[PDB]
């Protein structure tokens, strides 16, 4: 089978600067009757792929004028012209020449921006969970750049690290922030056991954390 | 232009088959297309399956190994994929899309349906609300949330408002664990807005057929 590789992994760029985005194949992309099958498409956050350019050098139906494919034979280039804050997500590379057919294992453009401090929220468990016996406490991190931080859990002044789960969104085009949630679950008689909860998040903003607690059974 | 959407059960038990319908709007199915089934695993990774094209005549991938069936119902614009013997491997999301068969051009795919290959049981979420300790609502903006807890299998849909609250908002990937999955999402608006304005989190499940439409109320007196 035709070997789709794209390069770089990852591209960071801010918007106003151009992109490119290289995609080698295996095997010649070209055919009997002088087309080549090679395809670049854009997986937006949450959406399906999407076209771009399509026989290797053409602006595919309705897509913005800025996207420029370039190249023939087993070497290709995707270039925008001047990057946009909707354009992140994962460019692919397919080819039609050979079956089966292949794609490329994807390039994801960041975009790059000022940095940005997270905005922490602790929350206690609800009363209606305490009801079932067990007992999540969630901390969010939200609009911050870049996208590593680090999140710490304390009960009662005591760094907590089993049963802590994490998830992380994906960059938003809306500001080119990132959000991350963390949720302590712990049974109910532990949580009514103990009395004061932190989450702490560390992030490239500060030397200092972000600290924001509560006490149980206190507004 | 035209338009795909794929449906079809979201959960099958290992060793069984999934079958899958796109149903194709806006455009025949017997003019100028490959349809294609094309599904996707963590990882940004991209299998193409096979596809039918306009005239009926079909092609799959080797790796599918005489478990590939792709097939269409012209009087109901649609086809199908049926995919038989499948292990947890064959978790993926599914998209049906069609790109013309002359040149590749106009790729149009569906949404995509995630299809979870699985022996556990389908359970409905808890959804709890998360409202704000009291000393973090004397700022500018406040923040509330929802925690969708112990479901399976995926997806849900979370709207806050019925969706009239868009702006603000932060919906997180599940995480798996035990074969149950928790989802959390937050809202953020201007903290004089709140409680006057109230704020409802709309949590669908339809693997089991479950709705919640749960109304965060503060701490402290309501």
């Known amino acids: 089978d035709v070997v789709m590789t794209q390069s770089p992994k990852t591209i960071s760029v801010t918007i106003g600067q151009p992109a490119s985005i290289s995609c080698k194949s295996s095997?010649?992309?070209?055919?009997?009757?002088?087309?080549?099958?090679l395809n670049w498409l854009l997986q937006r956050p949450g959406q399906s792929p999407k076209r771009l350019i399509y026989?290797?050098?053409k602006l595919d139906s309705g897509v913005p004028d800025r996207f420029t494919g370039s190249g023939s034979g087993t070497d290709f280039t995707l270039k925008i012209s001047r990057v946009e804050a909707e354009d992140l997500g994962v460019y692919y590379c397919?080819?039609?020449?050979?079956?089966?057919?292949?794609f490329g294992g994807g390039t994801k453009l960041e975009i790059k921006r000022a940095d940005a401090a997270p905005t922490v929220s602790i929350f206690p468990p609800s009363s209606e969970q305490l009801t079932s016996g067990g007992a999540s406490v969630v901390c969010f991190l939200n609009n911050f750049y870049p996208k590593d931080i680090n999140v710490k859990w304390k009960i009662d002044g005591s760094e907590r690290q089993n049963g802590v789960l994490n998830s992380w969104t994906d960059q938003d085009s809306k500001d080119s922030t990132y959000s991350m949630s963390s949720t302590l679950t712990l049974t109910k008689d532990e949580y009514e056991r103990h009395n004061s909860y932190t989450c702490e998040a560390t992030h490239k903003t500060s030397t200092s954390p972000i600290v924001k607690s509560f006490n149980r059974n206190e507004c | 232009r035209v338009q795909l959407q794929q449906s079809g059960p979201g959960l099958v038990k290992p060793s069984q088959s999934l079958s899958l319908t796109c149903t194709v709007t806006?455009?025949?199915?017997?003019?100028?297309?490959?349809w294609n089934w094309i599904r996707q695993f963590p990882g940004n990774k991209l299998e193409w399956m096979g596809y039918?094209?306009?005239?009926?005549?079909?092609s799959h991938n080797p790796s599918l190994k005489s478990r590939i069936s792709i097939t269409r119902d012209t009087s109901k614009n649609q086809f199908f994929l049926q995919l038989n013997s499948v292990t947890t491997e064959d978790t993926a999301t599914y998209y049906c899309?069609?790109?013309?068969?002359?040149?590749?051009?106009?790729?149009?795919w569906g949404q995509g349906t995630l299809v979870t290959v699985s022996a556990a049981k389908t359970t409905a979420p808890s959804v709890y609300p998360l409202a704000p300790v009291c000393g973090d609502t004397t700022g500018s903006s406040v923040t509330l949330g929802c925690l969708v807890k112990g479901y399976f299998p995926e997806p849900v849909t979370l709207t806050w408002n019925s969706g009239s609250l868009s702006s603000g908002v932060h919906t997180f990937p599940a995480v798996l664990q035990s074969d149950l999955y928790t989802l959390s999402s937050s809202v953020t608006v201007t903290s004089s807005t709140w409680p006057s304005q109230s704020i409802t989190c709309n949590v669908a499940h339809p693997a089991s057929s479950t709705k919640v439409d749960k109304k965060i109320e503060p701490r402290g007196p309501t």
């Open positions: 397919w080819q039609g020449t050979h079956f089966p057919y292949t």
């Open positions: 026989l290797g050098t």
């Open positions: 899309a069609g790109l013309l068969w002359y040149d590749g051009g106009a790729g149009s």
């Open positions: 806006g455009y025949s199915i017997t003019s100028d297309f490959a």
């Open positions: 039918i094209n306009y005239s009926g005549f079909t």
């Open positions: 095997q010649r992309l070209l055919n009997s009757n002088g087309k080549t099958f």
